[model samples]
Target: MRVRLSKTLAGILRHHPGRYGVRLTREGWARVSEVVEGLRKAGWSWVEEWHIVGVALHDPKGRYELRNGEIRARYGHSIPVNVEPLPGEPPPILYHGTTEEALPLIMERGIMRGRRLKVHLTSSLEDAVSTGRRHGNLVAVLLVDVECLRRRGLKVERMSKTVYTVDWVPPECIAEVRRESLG
Candidate 1:
């Protein structure tokens, strides 16, 4: 029950506020009380501000962030969120997990944010491959050189300990490709 509520909050804050009828700042900051009210309106009548606080505090992925009496997703914003740059510098190289079928177009157009707002990347091979596995049995991991991208004027944000986000990654940022089969 708690898991369901927490995950719902993620979709609400990270993706849709209009659908939830919640109020948020341009940077995605929403008042905790208002969010609780929004959830109540969404049929989660039992949800309260503390529930939102608990989820933000204990999220395994550190997906949500809280400030004073406001809350917002730390990253993974599907809508435009003009927030400050997250702290930390990205490593020299990063990895992106994608489907084998996406390999060609990704190489051509670089990596674009297909559905979500920003192109997600990670330095962990395991994380990248696991993400790719979500697409199909044949997963292709792209080895990205952050320095190469910086030289070409692409900006990257270190969203979490291992996760990175970029507006776009050019083909030139890709140093190599590694293919793996989940099956």
Candidate 2:
């Protein structure tokens, strides 16, 4: 879609070159086309809002295209602190660090199983290490990491109440977990 600039967006872009990038707002979406247009008018080149939106819509895991004068999309769902998405079923994997912290904030809503379980906590390097050590075993055992990487990162939450097509749980493993942990 060829979205043009909105006046409010235009003013923000003019004064805030650094701020005129793709980032999700509290409202759930960033003004992508507006940012691109504002930046373009300010002499930024090769700025494609479509590409940025595509990245948000299709490649959440893809790196933001950090170009000299280009703005990329970095939209995410807004999550709150302390409120876990779904607590009943153990997360296929518990992500820690920035990926985990930033994940819920960005992915404010969804399911946390199967393909949806891919999480990016975005914690400090230290927390990343600690969280990995504490949780990596279960993650590895459950195999959510591989699927997460493959699917460009998935956001699973409770409200969505939809399991990923490839729900991270393996039947035999769940049975094994039940046999060992429950009994």
Best by lDDT: 1
Candidate 1 — worst ten consecutive residues by lDDT sum?
Answer: 1-10
lDDT by residue for model 2 over 3-116, one digit each (tens)? 433323323422233455544333223356666665676665666766554543453332222343343322111221122343333244333322233233323432233211
Find the candidate with the highest TM-score and give its number: 1
Could you give the C-alpha RMSD of every candidate to the true structure, in order shown?
2.5, 14.2
TM-score of each: 0.85, 0.29
**TM-score of predicted model 2?**
0.29
lDDT of 1 by residue, 1-183 (tens): 344987788888888888778887888998888888888877887888788999999886677889999999877788788656668899888999998889889989899997788999898888898889977668999999999888888788877678888889999889989877533
Stretches of candidate 2 exceeding 4 Å from the true structure? 1-18, 21-25, 41-43, 60-92, 97-183
| Cα-based lDDT for every prediction | 0.84, 0.34
Q: Give every collision pair in model 1.
A: none
